[PDB]
Design a binder for this molecule. Structure first.
Ligand SMILES: Nc1ncnc2c1ncn2[C@@H]1O[C@H](COP(=O)(O)OP(=O)(O)O)[C@@H](O)[C@H]1O
Lengths: 232, 421
């Protein structure tokens, strides 16, 4: 499950003079009860190293944007699923959170994590905007979270009129480094992003972080907090 | 409604993007066509506001290596710059690949077509590459070439359509002969030769497509499709004559509005031995339009062996495909996977780049390096020139069953027979 890391998180806060780091419990985060219960059901106990700094920023009042770098098994996914689930209102039957995955097979993987952690949200439903979904033109998605690969997601927001992107509250880009390396994905994501509202929360996660990826991250996450955790 | 189909046996595979011209200050708005390709000799011709550039095609094609940023633009590549006194809005090549036409607008003098003998580009003993003949369209603003097409089988013959609605058929040998013309009141908006090159089809402001012998004697009228009302009147924007009784026809708002979006319509025609009406199928906006600032223009081409049509549009960042069905009569959109599409990039200032020119190379001899370990045979390469001055090449991999390789080895250009100024 969690990968070990002696190292420390480096944190560039969006606001230099507004220190607000480090939660050492989930109970501190003032999650909705059904979200904390979700967490509990998953067996989590303490936030992970990356989560300890990442969650207070993402779940700030109001939420803040983030570029985060940490290796596999640090808890990135868990952290952003919490992020999306805490903004979602199931009452409202239309997409509010939008997660981009570099592949089909991860779009589903992350989906499962969303479904498991959102277990106690009544009527929470997920759409998968990925290769080979069945949807006919004319339809409009009533699922409150959408996960998928950038091209199909872009179609749903534009061409096909499936999602109104002006209504999304949280946008996640998982695995930036892999994303960019895939044909089409960078431009696709930029195109999605640009049509999200100003107040949308943007979050971006990568394992690696070379200059291509950093410069991409800057186009996509305005006014970011940046977090790095050196690999071990 | 619109027929569509997930195609997993076709992918566009991006090669590195290559900068040709420097990024412009403003978005280029006017109808233009700035890429030509010699598939006989392996040359590409690119034009802009800023000269004409000729490359050996293989120099423009560079494959991504694992490790490389597939979004990094190569800065330049060796080719030849031919200075031009005025900006170019249209480039085209004759069917023998020996005559390049370059259309220019001068604010002072109006429009002129320059004709280059393609050997002159190869003539090391000419430091300056001059055209051998001009053709001056007395016209100034209404003299913009808006469509111009060489005959697919008569090398000396070219069809030219201007903004004012007039049209002309030219014969270009060692000099320029006007063979046929039709005045502006005919209202031509677009033009396209029959496959064998025996007739000319012209799109028109009134929404019809008229067929003509090269002498411009009228042969057949295709009426404006019945589904368009009188209070939503349209004009042919572009036309592609695919088979004798088969056409792709693009309609746009008669009045010039950019806001409405064009309809790509497939049309099947009856025969003399039929009294059926014309069958039209509206596929509508297969190249999704993100831009309402540019003059509409669909870049259409048919690839017989694959029985499909490639489509690009001045208002869209995406290339679309319309294939004939196993059926052999009807057409369908191909819906391709996210990482196998052909899209122009976002400019570094975060705007969309759009197409100014579109061609396909069939002289590529390099094999596609897939994994470390896997390699596929050479494929044709789609090439787009963007509004940002970047060239965008994509291999077209058609893995559908029974499709025969379209690759054709190129020849050396001999200076023999070069025409002089
Ligand atoms: N705070 C936590 N406590 C216990 N397990 C966790 C915690 N956060 C994540 N995990 C588990 O550890 C694994 C890695 O989490 P994940 O969010 O997938 O890491 P990453 O996204 O960085 O690859 C998963 O099995 C996940 O359920």
């Amino acid at each position: 499950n969690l990968v070990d890391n002696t190292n420390q998180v480096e944190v560039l806060q969006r606001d230099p003079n507004s220190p607000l780091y480090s939660v050492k419990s989930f109970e501190e985060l003032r999650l909705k009860p059904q979200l904390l219960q979700g967490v509990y059901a998953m067996g989590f106990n303490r936030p992970s190293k990356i989560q300890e700094n990442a969650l207070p920023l993402m779940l700030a009042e109001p939420p803040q944007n983030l570029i985060a770098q940490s290796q596999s098994g640090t808890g990135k996914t868990a952290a952003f699923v919490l992020a999306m689930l805490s903004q979602v209102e199931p009452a409202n039957k239309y997409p509010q959170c939008l997660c981009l995955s570099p592949t089909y097979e991860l779009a589903l993987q992350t989906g499962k994590v969303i479904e498991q952690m959102g277990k106690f949200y009544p009527e929470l439903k997920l759409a998968y905007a990925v290769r080979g979904n069945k949807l006919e033109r004319g339809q409009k998605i009533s699922e409150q979270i959408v996960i998928g690969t950038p091209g199909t997601v872009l179609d749903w927001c534009s061409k096909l009129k499936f999602i109104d992107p002006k209504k999304i509250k949280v946008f996640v880009l998982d695995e930036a480094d892999v994303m960019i390396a895939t044909q089409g994905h960078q431009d696709q994501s930029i195109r999605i992003q640009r049509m999200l509202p100003r107040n949308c929360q943007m979050l971006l996660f990568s394992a690696t972080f070379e200059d291509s990826v950093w410069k991409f991250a800057q186009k996509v996450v305005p006014d970011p907090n940046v977090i790095k955790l050196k690999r071990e | 409604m619109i027929p569509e189909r997930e195609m997993k046996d076709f992918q566009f595979r991006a090669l590195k993007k290559v900068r040709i011209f420097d990024s412009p200050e403003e978005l280029p708005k006017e109808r233009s066509s700035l890429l030509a390709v010699s598939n006989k000799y392996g040359l590409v011709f690119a034009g802009g506001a800023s000269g004409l550039q000729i490359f050996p095609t293989k120099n423009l094609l560079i494959q991504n290596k694992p490790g490389d940023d597939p979004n990094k633009i190569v800065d330049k590549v060796q080719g030849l710059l031919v200075p031009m006194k005025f900006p170019i809005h249209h480039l085209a090549l004759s069917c023998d690949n020996l005559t390049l036409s370059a259309c220019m607008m001068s604010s002072e003098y109006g429009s002129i077509i320059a004709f280059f003998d393609v050997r002159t580009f190869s003539n090391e003993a000419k430091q300056q590459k001059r055209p051998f003949a001009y053709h001056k369209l007395l016209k100034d603003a209404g003299g913009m070439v808006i469509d111009m097409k060489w005959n697919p089988t008569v090398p000396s013959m070219v069809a030219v359509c201007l903004a004012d609605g007039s049209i002309a058929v030219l014969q270009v040998t060692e000099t320029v002969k006007v063979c046929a013309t039709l005045p502006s009141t005919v209202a031509v908006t677009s033009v396209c030769w029959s496959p064998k090159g025996k007739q000319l089809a012209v799109g028109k402001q009134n929404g019809t497509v008229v067929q003509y012998l090269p002498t411009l004697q009228e042969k057949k009228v295709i009426p404006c499709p019945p589904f368009y009302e009188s209070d939503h009147p349209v004009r042919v924007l572009d036309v592609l004559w695919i088979g004798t009784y088969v056409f792709a026809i693009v309609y746009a708002a008669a009045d010039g509005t950019l806001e409405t979006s064009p309809d790509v319509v497939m049309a099947l025609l009856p025969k003399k031995e039929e009294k059926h009406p014309e069958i039209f199928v509206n596929f509508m906006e297969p190249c999704y339009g993100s831009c309402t600032e540019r003059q509409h223009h669909y870049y259409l081409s048919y690839i017989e062996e694959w029985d499909l049509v490639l489509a690009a549009s001045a208002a869209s960042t995406e290339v679309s495909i319309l294939a004939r069905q196993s059926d052999q009569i009807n057409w369908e959109s191909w819906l391709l996977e996210d990482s196998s599409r052909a899209e122009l990039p976002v400019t570094d200032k975060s705007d969309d780049s759009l197409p100014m020119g579109v061609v396909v190379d069939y002289t590529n001899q390099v094999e596609i390096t897939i994994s470390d370990e896997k390699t596929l045979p050479p494929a044709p390469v789609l090439m787009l020139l963007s509004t940002d001055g970047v060239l965008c090449p994509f291999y077209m991999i058609n893995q559908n069953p029974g499709v025969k390789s379209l690759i054709k080895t190129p020849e050396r250009l001999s200076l023999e027979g070069e025409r002089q100024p």
